[PDB]
């Protein structure tokens, strides 16, 4: 989840339905969600499944983290660079293929081209594709 920070900057005060506080962290994601704007570094707030798993992992062995959201906003595929004849990885995966990189952790699927350059780990979920269409509105209820 991505939510705007508070005035003091410390996003807090959220207790779960079971009587427990939901853990939160600080992300430096791009300010202007819309394109063509003066992009900056907002200190937004992130929390969810992935962040909970990350906190568990961090406590597990040993380290510290500086989680920051991606630049482009796209998962990552292959596309030949414009005004040239080479190819480079765009989006999130490009960040992993560069200095920032480290330990990208997000709902990133498993493929072949992706598996060719980088190494994965054992999965932590299982999913299909599940075509989605708008639900019909039933108009037959003995009204007429």
């Amino acid at each position: 989840y991505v939510k705007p920070t508070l005035s003091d900057g410390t996003c807090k005060e959220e207790f779960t339905v079971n009587g427990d506080p939901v853990k939160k962290v600080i992300c430096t994601g791009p300010n202007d969600t819309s394109p063509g704007s003066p992009r900056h570094t907002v200190p937004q707030c992130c929390y969810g499944f992935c962040i909970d798993l990350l906190i568990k992992l961090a406590r597990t062995m040993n380290f510290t983290y500086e989680v920051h959201l991606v630049a482009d906003g796209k998962f990552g595929t292959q596309e030949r660079v414009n005004n040239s004849n080479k190819k480079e990885w765009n989006g999130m995966m490009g960040e992993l293929l560069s200095g920032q990189a480290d330990m990208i952790v997000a709902p990133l699927t498993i493929n072949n081209e992706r598996a060719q350059y980088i190494e994965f780990s054992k999965p932590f979920k299982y999913q299909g594709l599940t075509i989605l269409v708008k639900k019909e509105i039933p108009r037959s209820t003995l009204d007429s």
């Binding site: 498993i110 493929n111 072949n112 598996a115 054992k122 999965p123 299982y126 003995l142």
Partner: protein, 276 residues
């Protein structure tokens, strides 16, 4: 499941909602209007005949006598025909709809928590020397130390005996269990949880400890999954027999109880009125 699973839907009827109460108050207002027109003892007879025509014309009445009264009686009778037709259609629609129920709806539940002091103790079908036994032993010993009394020979003997009725429920790998449930004759066997797992992990072609084959095998197998061969192969080799192919005495016990309670309340009211 021991026998057929059907939903009586005694309390699932479209009644017990706001629509029924609204119809009741509307018919009360209609009866009041009819009484007012008739007057322009008979009130009780009018109520009795209205309730009858709501149910059936099997209750004769001589309360109404007029032109406008006859007109509204005819209109209300037409609405009675409409209402009974609607009830028949709704009951037919219920007839064409059927749903089943589960038994435990969870692995770490009360049923597999204290079998001794809860009904006749259950039977936990499991096989020793396997992954599932190791995971159960490592997770919590109580269920394991109770299930150690029933460790069947293999796979065929266990569910053969269960079909004979000796055992209660089987705990084993999910894929082979799904295949067997889809393949068995009569489709009298089914998983308690409809596609519910507890410790989801995949299979694996176990290599050695660092042999220079891992990269090529992993890439090739991922390519196989991506190319769609696995789906066709699973359709060819792993498909169930039925699987994808989709007024009893006690079906209305609640209605019986409600009618008995209403009769008792009517008797109590009659006794009070006789006293009063």
């Amino acid at each position: 499941r021991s026998n057929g699973t059907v939903s009586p839907s005694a309390f699932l009827e479209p009644f017990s909602a706001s629509v029924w109460v609204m119809m009741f108050v509307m018919l009360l207002i209609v009866s009041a209007i009819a009484v007012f027109v008739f007057e322009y003892f008979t009130i009780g007879k009018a109520i009795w005949l209205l309730w009858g025509l709501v149910f059936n014309n099997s209750v004769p009445v001589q309360n109404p006598k007029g032109t406008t009264s006859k007109i509204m009686v005819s209109v209300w009778a037409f609405f009675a025909v409409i209402f009974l037709a609607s009830y028949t259609a709704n009951l037919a629609a219920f007839m064409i709809q059927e749903e089943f129920v589960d038994q435990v709806t969870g692995l770490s539940d009360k049923k597999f928590q204290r079998p001794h002091d809860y009904s006749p103790p259950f039977r936990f079908g499991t096989v020793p020397n396997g992954s599932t036994e190791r995971n159960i032993r490592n997770n919590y010993p109580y269920m394991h130390q109770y299930m150690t009394k029933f460790n069947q020979k293999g796979v065929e003997d266990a569910l053969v005996s269960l079909k004979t009725g000796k055992l209660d429920a089987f705990i084993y790998d999910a894929a082979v269990l799904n295949y067997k449930a889809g393949r068995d004759e009569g489709c009298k066997l089914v998983t308690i949880g409809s596609g519910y797992i507890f410790a989801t992990t995949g299979y694996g072609i176990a290599l050695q400890k660092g042999s220079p084959w891992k990269r090529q095998i992993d890439l090739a197998l991922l390519q196989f999954v991506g190319d769609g061969e696995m789906e066709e192969l699973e359709t060819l080799w792993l498909t169930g027999i039925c699987h994808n192919e989709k007024l009893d005495i006690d079906n209305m016990a609640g209605v019986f109880y409600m009618l008995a309670a209403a009769m008792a309340l009517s008797l109590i009211t009659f006794i009070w009125e006789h006293l009063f």
